[PDB]
RNA sequence: AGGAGAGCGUCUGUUGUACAUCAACACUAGAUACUGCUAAUACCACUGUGGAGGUAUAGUAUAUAAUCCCUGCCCGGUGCAGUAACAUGUAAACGGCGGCUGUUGACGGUCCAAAGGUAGGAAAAUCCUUGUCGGGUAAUUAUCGUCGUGCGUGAAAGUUGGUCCGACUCUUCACAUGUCGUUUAUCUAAAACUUUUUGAAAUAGAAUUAUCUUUGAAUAUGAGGAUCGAGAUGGCCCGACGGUUCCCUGAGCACCUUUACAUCCCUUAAAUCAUAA
RNA sequence: UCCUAUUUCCUAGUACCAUUAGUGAACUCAUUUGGUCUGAUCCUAAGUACGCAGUGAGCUAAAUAGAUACAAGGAACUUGACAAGCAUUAC
RNA sequence: AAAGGAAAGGUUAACCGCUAUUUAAACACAAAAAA
RNA sequence: AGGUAUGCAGUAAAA
RNA sequence: UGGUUCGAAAAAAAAAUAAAAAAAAAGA
RNA sequence: CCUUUUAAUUGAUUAUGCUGACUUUAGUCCCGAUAAACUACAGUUCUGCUUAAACUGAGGAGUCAAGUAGGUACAAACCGUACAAGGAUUAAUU
RNA sequence: UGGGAGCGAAGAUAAUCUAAUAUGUAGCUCCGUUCAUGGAAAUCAAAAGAGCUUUCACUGAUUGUAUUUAUGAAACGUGAAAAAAAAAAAA
RNA sequence: UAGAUUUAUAUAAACGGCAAAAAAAAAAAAAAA
RNA sequence: UGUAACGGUACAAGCUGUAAACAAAGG
């Protein structure tokens, strides 16, 4: 009998480092998630309000996003939509989402009435196209995307591995002697153009040697980390929101399809 | 029961990762104590409802309500302005205990309503003979925290504490002396009397936990006498073990101020004490996060547009510098906001003057920006650039920081409102400039 | 005695059996203090 | 596993323990 | 026996028991356990020692040997 | 077992209601009007009225049979282990049972409140969860969609996750022809289609049913195992006669509800285990023969070398176990019309 | 144990040829003690080796007697 | 024996919960038998009679029956 | 623990801790029987619990077991089912499956019976001093194959087989070989002898306790006769029926069986109120 | 005036009880040197930049337990290839 | 496939609960009712 | 995949 | 760093122990 | 003394008797795995096995037992020894 | 508590065995012992009589029950001990 | 009987339904002590 | 009532309760 716990855990774990490495694999790559992609979207509804509303108000979209097939959903934020969409486009999107919600609420509760069906059909098709433009076949996790873009390849990761800065300009008291590859993802479900993905070095990478032991040989976004993953011209802000049937990646720009874009 | 082998492996790995997560989580909790203290011997035994109609409140009820709201962080503007109105109506009928609790609530909540303090102070002065230690301490403490300066009344409170020395609590006396020093209200005779009494209070009545509160660099520099300075600096070496980063920081600042402005006292110290403070100068004293204010950021933006390299909000020695230029490191700037002066006046605080003098004597060429003048520029950038250039083209400021012109509460309120409007406009037109707004959808 | 039986047994002093015997240091016919 | 599983009081409904907030 | 108070072991103590055994020695309580493993202390419950000003006190632990003679004579003068 | 909800909640001989109503309207009169409207809508939608027979089941099954990107990229799984089919192609869900509709199973391990073994040959087995399946189909006149089919470790049949039109989730027994996307309803006006639940008095003769209530509103109790089904033989005003999977003909009150179709997973009996370990996982323990023991341990035990039974077969407790009837003679037959005979006689006659 | 409740006396009823002396461990411990004393200017080993009534100041001995 | 040898265990939790003071109280045994380290009902004589030369002002006989404030 | 084979169990498993690791038990599967749900069965406070929060593709009971081909005849007996009772059914229900004679006898006679043991193994874990013939050997009470000669066995209380398996019982070939004719050399020791340290045990009626030959409660250190110089130490076990943990019997005990007897519990058969209609 | 917000937040001295933080079955047990040796793991090791541990003295008898090496023969042994033997040998 | 965690706590949401409630500690700081 | 630092009640969701 | 404490969850009570002494007028 | 009586449960070479003491076997069996030196002018014996770092922002990756098993004079004594803020900021004093 | 109440065995005798004896005993639970148990006749007896209840001796190991073993302070009665009936319609 | 007199010995029974925790909503719920 | 645990006392099979062997002379 004992009540020791925490740092005095009486469980005799193995110390074998190879077994612990296998445990790492099982605990991270092969971990099981109960929730679904829409569960994650709802959890982040306050930051992704517009897309949450569209998913819940456009018929068929929820059914498509709740299917077993492993999927990857690139979720834009309301901030991203506001920043990148023109004011008129944002107003139109808000008005149409509100219209669908209002028709749904009417269901809960001449030619003018006939036109309502046509408008509903048009709005549903357009918003379904928009929302499904972010759904991609397969489960593409963040590290897989980075390794596909080439980060981690010793032959290609140059310009991302040895970033340095003019140190004396930022940590002068320590430098008195100085004081003197585009990967392609399958097309969205509603389009045929495959999605380009690339990687870049963040502004924070250059400062690593100032505060870390290094073994080197002979505007800018504020998102954290050393590497930035760009998908279709949009930056991933929060990745690996894993689910049971896919993964959600948060992005800072909406991937509007060419059909919905205005040519002039 | 049994599990399928895949399930066994997955759950075992989850357990291992949970253990490692716990171990990693507890790594930085050096100063996490499972045993914790909570102060509750100031809570009154009577019950009150804070939202009750003020017209039914008396002094005893309103004071308790104010203190309870301050404790519970119920910072509602309507509620506290009703409190102010009712308290001003009841000014004639408050005891020193009730006035002390009211001042505690106002100061603790940092409710910067100058009119209430101004209207309550005359009754405090009149009733001073009946005041007790806690009430005197609380009045001084709240005034110091909110920057409501009344030197005559503060001096009267200190004199009352001296007269009631045999009844004053040591902590209350220490706080009163610190507040007097910070408000600059003691002429030399009162300063000498306070130092003489504080010496005996600390030597006879205060253990380490009470004494460490006496270590304040402003008081050491401007108020304490030489024997008191020597005693304080010697005693800190003995009482360091029980101190916290704030106490260490104030001790270090006191030592630097004595060294820079009182070399005779520094030399009158002993070699062991001097060694203690030299070794203290080598330690990493935990600071707390500081960031440029909106006014600081506006000044930095104007300076950068002018074309002067600079750095912001950094620590040199035992001081924090607002702006430190890079090309000529000795040139530095300070952006002075409403809280750097006393309410309704352009008179600098004692801490600000002490820091200015110490940095100037250590070599810094200081220049200063006043929000009262900056706000009159508006949102214009050319005007701000010209302002900063003209300031640069002029000599640095003397080692002694002189106060600005006279002002009034009316002008202070007007300038605060103008600063609010300018902040709003600048933030709006910053974020709008950031937003691209280039995607046009043919959805219609 | 194990938990299941302990959960159903009662303490010795919950009855009067303790006072119905005369066992003592001197024998089996204890004369109580105060007779 | 549960020594008191069969008792009349095992997993009894109600009680002051679980009815703290009930008026 | 091999466990218990026999062979001079006496009553059980946390020193001799496994971790989890709870047994103090008679100290007063000074606070409350929280719901998350903490303990909030209340200094109002600290006993207050009442000590008089011992400075300038002519009394001492013992009494001089002559006091017996002095008091005995002073009482005999009354009794006689 | 009784380790779940207490007796006060589980035991009720006479159920006073058969419709679990969840009205939305503010008043009782408007609730009644809405219920009538819903019943009329179900009646309007109902079109199929012919019996659902074995042959129609076969035709539907034949019709159903006639009618690389999707993976975790960069995820090299186990060296040898792999699921039999990916989630988007497996017949069953491949996921986890809903937590809100299930609880941990209390494993009694064949021991009663006395702690002694009463049910022999029981083992721990794999950990299991009890899931709350709606045997009542209490919600009437509301359509629901079958979203997925699920495995159940305590039950020989498959379960189906039903999402009612208002968002309520429940688990029901799945029929042999139940597929994701199916629409189901419980009502007296419902069409005769598999999965629908109707009173036995509204189901035409020759129809195949399952999950039959012994008492109205008390939840189906008869015909539950995978592949089992019962046939409607005759109907009168108050009683309906059913032929059961055991070849027993029994009458049921016309107000007892039932579901149309055969119980899913008719291939359960075709499973081959291959080794003792599969039964060990399933929760079995070795069965020692009576004649392998000593005479003190079984009536068949004893005797140098191997021997025969030396008497007509009896159990551990001295009861004939080959042809000896055990139903209480005085217990009335009640609604039982005719009870089956021995399988040898059935197959020889 | 010190209370003599164990059964360790049972083996001591039989002869053994010898016993390990643990001299490596004991000498490490002794030299640790000697270093602790010596850093303060004490010759513990010399004190332990002194004859009864013998006085030797500093690091002196028979060799000092010989050469003086 | 088979493999590693296992004998009677020394378990403080088990011993104290099964054979301690309260467990012995709950047992059904002869409680008139003297137990050195446990409950028993072999009652003692109490404080003996005072010798004729002792001080009655200091002789004591009762503790609980006369317990005042 | 290799190559080539046989027997028993299919197999991986369980297994008597401390004389039995096996051919014994279990096992995947094929069957039979009971059970309509407050199910049967089990526990035996019984309006309770496990069964099972399961519902005849389920649960319980009893055999036989995994793969292939097969699984003959008998309901006379016993049990069970069936019916008011019969009739009748049920053997993968418990069980059983001939004798004396004529023509080596296809084919007859006669008695008996419910049926008269079928197919297939077969000198066998059954029979037995080493059955006939063949391979291996110089020599084959062994082993394999074969005959069906002798004794016989025998069909889900299962018959005959294919492959693989076993700390199982056996046959054979090969290998370097101290297993052997038959032993020797060197070295070490939880081996022995001396010494230092230090110290038991089983046993003991008493002993100053010889060999031959005899006698004797019948195989004597002690009794008759004859003969004979003895103590310790090292070794060896001829004797001292050497010392200490198998067989019969009692007006003794314990456990097991049931067409031994008696009693009790249960299930039937009933009875009795609740109980009025 | 192009950072996704330019958002005040260090450690209130701290109830009671446990701990010898290392080698090591360190437990039950007792012919109990606590600690060496007898097995995996735990430090990118020329065994981890000198670590942990090391118990009276003698002495050619045989017998025994082992280790090594056996000429030529090669199972002739034995109930039985039990036990042994091979699985090293120019480089 | 043999079909596997959800009590208390933290996070987010919601919230007309309460000194059973963050020092009578401190730092920082263009900052805020009504009119 | 027990509970982490103003603390008692209290609903939902979930790497 | 653990126990304690909330949960698991337990009168399934470790004799000489406690957030555990008659339980708010507490005199701030 | 003698006399009379005594219910003393009154006589022991023996119950593989009971509780003990003391002989014989006998000065016999029993002695666990590797050991040396510490010096008449410098030093580094040999062997078995290898987690022996003890701050580098991290309580140094556990549980359990010793009812205190590595403190201390060639001690089976006396005395002493588990500090969660690690107290020596003792770069002091001299 | 060999007193009183409830439930209630076997070893032993019967030379096995059954009844009966052991025994209404042991264990278990409950009263708590003269300030108690009990009790002032719808009693017992003979055609005469006794006079609540209780203890002792005799009648007597009788008449009985058990029918191989044993059990049996029987009833009436006789000689003694103790002696009691009932304060009390209110005030 | 001058004062003082720690802790354990699970006690609202100086008392009344039984029944866990010296006494627990009705019912389920069961008894030779 | 009885007993015990710790503590004090000659570190105790005695005595004793933090007032732990003694107050007897108080407006």
Author numbering:
A (entry chain Xf): 359 to 467, 480 to 550, 576, 590 to 626, 653 to 698
B (entry chain Xi): 2 to 445
C (entry chain XI): 1 to 35
D (entry chain Xm): 0 to 22
E (entry chain AA): 41 to 120
F (entry chain Aa): 1 to 67, 76 to 357
G (entry chain Xy): 348 to 415
H (entry chain Xa): 113 to 181
What does the paper say about this structure?
Mitochondrial ribosomes (mitoribosomes) play the central and ubiquitous role of synthesising mitochondrial proteins which are essential for the survival of almost all eukaryotes including parasites. In contrast, the mitoribosome of the apicomplexan parasite Toxoplasma gondii assembles from over 50 extremely short rRNA molecules. We resolved the complete mitoribosome structure with map resolutions of the large and small ribosomal subunits (LSU and SSU) ranging from 2.2 to 2.8 Å. The result of these analyses reveals a total of 53 rRNA molecules, markedly exceeding the previously predicted level of fragmentation.
The 32 LSU and 21 SSU rRNA molecules are extremely short, ranging from 278 to just seven nucleotides. The structure consists of a total of 124 modelled proteins, as well as a Zn2+, a Mg2+ and an ATP, molecules in the SSU and a Zn2+ and two Fe2S2 in the LSU. One example, mL138, is closely associated with two rRNA molecules (LSU-20 and LSU-21) and interact with four more (LSU-11, LSU-17, LSU-18, LSU-19). The contact sites on the CP are likewise remodelled, exclusively mediated by protein extensions from the widely conserved proteins, mL40 and mL46. In its place we instead observe two proteins, mL150 and mL157, which provide the binding interface for mL40 and mL46. mL150 and mL157 therefore act as a keystone in maintaining LSU-SSU contacts. However, neither protein features a substantial tertiary fold. Instead, each protein includes a prominent, solvent accessible, rhombic Fe2S2 cluster. The positioning of mL150 and mL157, the arrangement of the coordinating cysteines and the solvent accessibility of both FeS clusters, highlight a potential that these proteins may likewise play a role during ribosome assembly or translation. We observed broad similarities with the vestibular area of the Tetrahymena mitoribosome, with the exception of a five-residue loop insertion in uL23m in T. gondii. The insertion, coupled with a stronger helical propensity in the anchoring helix of mL105, produces an additional kink in the late exit tunnel.
